[PDB]
Amino acid sequence: YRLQGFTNAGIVAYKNIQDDNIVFSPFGYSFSMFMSLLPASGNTRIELLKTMDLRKRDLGPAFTELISGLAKLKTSKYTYTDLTYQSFVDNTVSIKPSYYQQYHRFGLYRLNFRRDAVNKINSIVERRSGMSNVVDSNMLDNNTLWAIINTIYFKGIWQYPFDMMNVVTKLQGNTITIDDEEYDMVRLPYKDANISMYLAIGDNMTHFTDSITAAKLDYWSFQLGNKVYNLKLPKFSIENKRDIKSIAEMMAPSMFNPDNASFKHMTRDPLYIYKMFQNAKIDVDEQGTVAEASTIMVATANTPFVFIIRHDITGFILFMGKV
Amino acid sequence: PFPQTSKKIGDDATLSCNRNNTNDYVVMSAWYKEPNSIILLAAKSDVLYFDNYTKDKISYDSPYDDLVTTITIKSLTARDAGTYVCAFFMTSTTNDTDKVDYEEYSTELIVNT
Amino acid sequence: LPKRDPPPGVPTDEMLLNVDKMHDVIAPAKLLEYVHIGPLAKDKEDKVKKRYPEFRLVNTGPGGLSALLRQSYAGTAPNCCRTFQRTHYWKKDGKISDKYEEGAVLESCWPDVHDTGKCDVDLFDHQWIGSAFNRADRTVEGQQSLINLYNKMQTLCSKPICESFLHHLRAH
Amino acid sequence: TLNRIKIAPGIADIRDKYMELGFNYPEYNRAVKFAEESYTYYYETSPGEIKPKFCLIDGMSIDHCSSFIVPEFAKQYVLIHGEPCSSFKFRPGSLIYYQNEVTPEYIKDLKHATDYIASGQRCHFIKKDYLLGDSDSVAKCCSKTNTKHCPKIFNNNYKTEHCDDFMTGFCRNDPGNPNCLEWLRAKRKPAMSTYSDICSKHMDARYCSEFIRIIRPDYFTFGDTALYVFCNDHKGNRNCWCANYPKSRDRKWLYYNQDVQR
Numbered sequence: 015y016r017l018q019g020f021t022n023a024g025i026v027a028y029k030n031i032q033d034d035n036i037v038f039s040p041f042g043y044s045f046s047m048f049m050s051l052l053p054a055s056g057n058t059r060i061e062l063l064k065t066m067d068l069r070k071r072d073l074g075p076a077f078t079e080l081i082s083g084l085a086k087l088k089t090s091k092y093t094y095t096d097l098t099y100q101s102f103v104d105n106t107v108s109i110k111p112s113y114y115q116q117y118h119r120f121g122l123y124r125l126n127f128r129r130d131a132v133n134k135i136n137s138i139v140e141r142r143s144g145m146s147n148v149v150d151s152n153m154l155d156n157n158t159l160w161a162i163i164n165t166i167y168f169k170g171i172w173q174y175p176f177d178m179m180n181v182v183t184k185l186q187g188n189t190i191t192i193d194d195e196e197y198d199m200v201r202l203p204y205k206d207a208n209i210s211m212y213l214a215i216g217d218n219m220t221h222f223t224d225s226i227t228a229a230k231l232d233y234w235s236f237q238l239g240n241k242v243y244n245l246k247l248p249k250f251s252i253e254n255k256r257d258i259k260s261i262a263e264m265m266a267p268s269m270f271n272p273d274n275a276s277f278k279h280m281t282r283d284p285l286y287i288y289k290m291f292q293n294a295k296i297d298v299d300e301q302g303t304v305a306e307a308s309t310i311m312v313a314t315a316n317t318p319f320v321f322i323i324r325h326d327i328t329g330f331i332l333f334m335g336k337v
Numbered sequence: 338p339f340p341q342t343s344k345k346i347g348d349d350a351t352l353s354c355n356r357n358n359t360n361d362y363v364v365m366s367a368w369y370k371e372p373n374s375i376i377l378l379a380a381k382s383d384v385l386y387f388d389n390y391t392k393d394k395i396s397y398d399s400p401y402d403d404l405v406t407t408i409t410i411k412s413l414t415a416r417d418a419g420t421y422v423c424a425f426f427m428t429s430t431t432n433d434t435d436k437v438d439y440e441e442y443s444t445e446l447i448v449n450t
Numbered sequence: 451l452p453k454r455d456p457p458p459g460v461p462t463d464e465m466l467l468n469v470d471k472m473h474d475v476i477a478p479a480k481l482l483e484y485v486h487i488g489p490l491a492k493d494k495e496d497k498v499k500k501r502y503p504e505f506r507l508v509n510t511g512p513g514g515l516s517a518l519l520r521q522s523y524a525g526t527a528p529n530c531c532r533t534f535q536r537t538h539y540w541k542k543d544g545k546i547s548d549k550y551e552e553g554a555v556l557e558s559c560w561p562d563v564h565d566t567g568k569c570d571v572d573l574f575d576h577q578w579i580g581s582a583f584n585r586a587d588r589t590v591e592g593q594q595s596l597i598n599l600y601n602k603m604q605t606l607c608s609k610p611i612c613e614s615f616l617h618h619l620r621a622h
Numbered sequence: 623t624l625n626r627i628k629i630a631p632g633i634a635d636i637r638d639k640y641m642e643l644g645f646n647y648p649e650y651n652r653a654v655k656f657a658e659e660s661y662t663y664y665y666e667t668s669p670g671e672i673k674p675k676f677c678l679i680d681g682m683s684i685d686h687c688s689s690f691i692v693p694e695f696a697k698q699y700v701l702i703h704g705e706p707c708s709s710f711k712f713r714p715g716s717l718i719y720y721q722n723e724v725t726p727e728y729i730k731d732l733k734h735a736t737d738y739i740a741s742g743q744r745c746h747f748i749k750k751d752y753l754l755g756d757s758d759s760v761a762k763c764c765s766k767t768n769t770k771h772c773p774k775i776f777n778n779n780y781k782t783e784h785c786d787d788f789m790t791g792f793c794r795n796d797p798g799n800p801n802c803l804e805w806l807r808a809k810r811k812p813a814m815s816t817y818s819d820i821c822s823k824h825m826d827a828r829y830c831s832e833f834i835r836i837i838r839p840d841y842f843t844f845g846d847t848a849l850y851v852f853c854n855d856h857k858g859n860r861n862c863w864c865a866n867y868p869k870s871r872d873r874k875w876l877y878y879n880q881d882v883q884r
């Protein structure tokens with residue numbers, strides 16, 4: 015009924031970043047954490063429901079609006095979106111007969127972690143989506159018995175064609191005052207869709223990135239108003255890869271704990287997770303924008319301007335970062 | 338054991354299903370092909386297409402009826418001639434409870450000259 | 451407190467559509483077909499449900515906007531297979547008819563019923579014999595009863611209807 | 623209760639307005655993101671559907687949100703049960719979107735305690751084929767005289783049998799319309815049986831000639847018997863006594879056998 019706090023979980027995951035090279039992907043990280051509610055049970059089920067303010071009667075219908083959002087992101091061909099999912103379960107895992115047809119076609123592919131398990135993970139990623147080498151050699155060790163994977167790909171094209179590139183064009187622009195601060199946010203819409211790419215230039219990025227939120231970003235996406243403007247934008251390429259483990263023990267600690275892992279629906283024997291890792295990307299060209307991201311949750315492994323990509327009405331915060 | 342509803346070359350291959358219990362609330366309805374294809378998934382009036390499928394080959398001509406889901410595949414093809422996997426992922430909303438109910442009624446359609 | 455009035459509505463043809471004067475359109479309908487009508491309230495629901503035992507009424511949209519969905523389509527052989535023209539006849543005070551009348555329950559006949567063979571047994575105890583070669587339905591149930599009728603006719607004729615069958619048996 | 627009244631109009635879109643619902647209690651202090659409507663949606667909102675800003679209310683006339691679609695193309699649209707939308711009791715048709723710290727539980731307690739929110743479903747149009755009018759309109763465009771304004775399922779050059787019933791009688795009264803011949807090409811048995819009776823009443827007309835050439839090859843038996851009956855009492859014909867009951871330009875007055883041997 016409401017995927018309200020779902021986006022904020024990824025937003026907060028960006029907040030705890032202390033660096034200067036960011037392509038963070040909130041949608042990829044949040045999707046794996048929320049939908050992992052399926053095998054959770056007992057103590058683990060109640061803790062995640064407390065997280066996102068989901069009353070336990072409301073599980074179920076949450077999946078429905080997610081489906082509506084996934085379909086709504088595809089409304090054309092020039093600018094579209096993609097999303098896939100895939101998990102992994104070992105042969106030695108005592109899978110309940112109920113699950114082997116309840117969600118057989120979703121995932122839960124069987125394999126063995128001790129016979130070229132890295133290659134087994136590899137062969138399924140490229141079929142589901144356009145990812146290339148989300149895996150790494152040191153991902154697995156002697157205690158690996160589970161895995162899970164997410165994926166996002168993007169493609170967009172500007173509304174007003176391009177004309178350090180300076181463009182004289184009619185557009186929406188104004189000045190924003192967060193708190194004793196001055197930025198001139200400039201909206202750059204796309205074509206035949208309702209998604210866009212934003213801009214902002216300033217000096218103290220800490221006062222800017224510490225309050226980024228889908229809630230407040232709407233309040234900044236409308237103060238912009240139509241009037242003739244003249245902006246400059248370069249071509250570049252950004253990169254980021256980091257870790258999420260240290261920022262996860264506050265939300266669902268028991269999933270990592272082998273003693274507190276209450277996963278009693280998929281399987282009865284104990285099982286637990288260790289870490290997770292993320293690899294984000296973005297490219298910039300003249301015609302439009304290209305964006306990409308992925309996520310793994312497995313045992314082991316001045317004056318700049320900020321870019322933000324956002325859907326207009328749904329609120330699914332796509333990749334954000336600084337240049 | 339449902340009889341195989343059969344149609345002719347390139348016509349309305351109108352398949353159908355049916356649930357048992359009315360008071361149980363449907364959370365999702367999906368249309369698969371055996372064993373794992375997911376021809377298309379849907380919910381309410383919004384249809385989420387999978388892989389290579391759009392409105393030209395399958396539509397959802399029961400968007401304002403919740404008793405039975407039906408499909409109206411046009412321009413029938415030999416590729417479309419196969420086993421079909423209906424789906425009613427079920428849940429109960431009387432009070433707070435943990436339960437899932439996967440009801441399946443697989444139907445076959447055969448096309449020939 | 452601001453106050454605003456909705457702009458003047460444009461009444462589309464959906465809203466003026468009436469359930470009556472439609473019985474030359476409702477009767478022609480196949481299985482699992484949603485014949486859209488106007489807003490049908492409970493005032494007419496009982497008389498239309500008896501007039502249409504072949505339809506389950508379902509709610510389509512807001513304001514009682516509904517449409518009669520036909521789920522079963524059976525042809526009562528006592529009339530249909532003998533009176534070829536009547537694809538939909540009524541039952542007024544226990545009598546078959548051809549025009550629409552009030553109160554008379556409506557019943558149609560299975561489409562191309564002579565391609566199905568439902569009334570072959572009833573007809574046994576020019577019109578239906580000519581449907582032999584039009585048996586392109588290829589149904590498993592229909593074919594077995596077809597050859598049952600063919601063998602029975604062949605033997606009973608060997609030992610008017612039989613006389614005509616000899617003429618039909620040129621290239622059928 | 624409610625005290626703040628700031629409508630806070632925007633610059634990007636005049637429809638986008640931000641009613642600042644500032645109640646007395648500090649946590650009950652939120653500025654919502656709603657929008658109104660003042661457009662004419664001759665264009666399309668989403669592929670196959672239209673989503674205006676009018677949050678329809680239960681117990682109210684369904685004619686409200688059919689205003690905003692431009693006519694002479696709205697004749698293809700029908701309504702459905704929309705997703706549960708909340709409106710303003712003081713702003714009939716206002717549509718509030720879910721964002722910020724506003725939650726359905728928070729507004730549900732708001733509306734239940736004090737009714738400034740009108741429950742309902744968002745107006746939601748679905749495109750399909752055209753719809754049909756009355757019996758006279760069935761007479762008009764099924765007879766292929768005005769091949770517009772009615773569903774293509776009727777205008778499909780006599781492909782489906784829904785308008786078979788009426789023009790059966792119309793063709794019985796007058797076989798003059800060439801569109802009757804097109805319907806004879808539709809390859810249906812009830813149509814052949816009914817009009818062949820008209821053919822058996824008057825056979826000299828040329829309409830019976832192409833009747834033999836169109837549908838008779840499919841159903842030889844019924845046409846041949848009816849033709850045999852006509853010449854039984856009408857023996858004044860000068861071509862129905864050639865190898866017939868009263869015993870090579872036209873074969874309309876003969877069985878299928880006689881022409882093959884010659």
Ligand SMILES: *[C@@H]1O[C@H](CO)[C@@H](O[C@@H]2O[C@H](CO)[C@@H](O[C@@H]3O[C@H](CO[C@H]4O[C@H](CO[C@H]5O[C@H](CO)[C@@H](O)[C@H](O)[C@@H]5O)[C@@H](O)[C@H](O)[C@@H]4O)[C@@H](O)[C@H](O)[C@@H]3O)[C@H](O)[C@H]2NC(C)=O)[C@H](O)[C@H]1NC(C)=O
Pocket residue numbers: 089090206207208664665666667668695749
């Ligand atoms: C979300 O984003 C979508 C795009 O993804 C936005 O919709 C676009 O809106 C713009 C501006 O209104 C459109 O741009 C212009 O649209 C015209 C193209 O034709 C349009 O009108 C046709 C009307 O046809 C009528 O009659 C035919 C029968 O002849 C019927 O089939 C129709 O239903 C109509 O009754 C439509 O068929 C056609 O689809 C278009 O709507 C034209 O003036 C210009 O060339 C220009 O393209 C744009 O086409 C819309 N759609 C798309 C896919 O790009 C939408 O507003 C956004 N939602 C928001 C902002 O809330």
Ligand SMILES: *[C@@H]1O[C@H](CO[C@@H]2O[C@@H](C)[C@@H](O)[C@@H](O)[C@@H]2O)[C@@H](O)[C@H](O)[C@H]1NC(C)=O
Pocket residue numbers: 193218219220221
């Ligand atoms: C950017 O400016 C920040 C301002 O402080 C922040 O905002 C004020 C209003 C208070 O809420 C305060 O607690 C916040 O921390 C500085 O903290 C920050 O260091 C500045 N950035 C850099 C890189 O120096």
Ligand SMILES: *[C@@H]1O[C@H](CO)[C@@H](O)[C@H](O)[C@H]1NC(C)=O
Pocket residue numbers: 357358
């Ligand atoms: C399921 O259907 C069967 C078969 O008619 C019936 O016996 C049973 O009661 C149904 N279950 C319900 C209604 O819960």
Ligand SMILES: *[C@@H]1O[C@H](CO)[C@@H](O)[C@H](O)[C@H]1NC(C)=O
Pocket residue numbers: 431432433
């Ligand atoms: C079901 O029980 C829950 C508490 O467990 C309660 O909130 C709810 O109102 C109950 N439903 C009905 C229909 O009584």
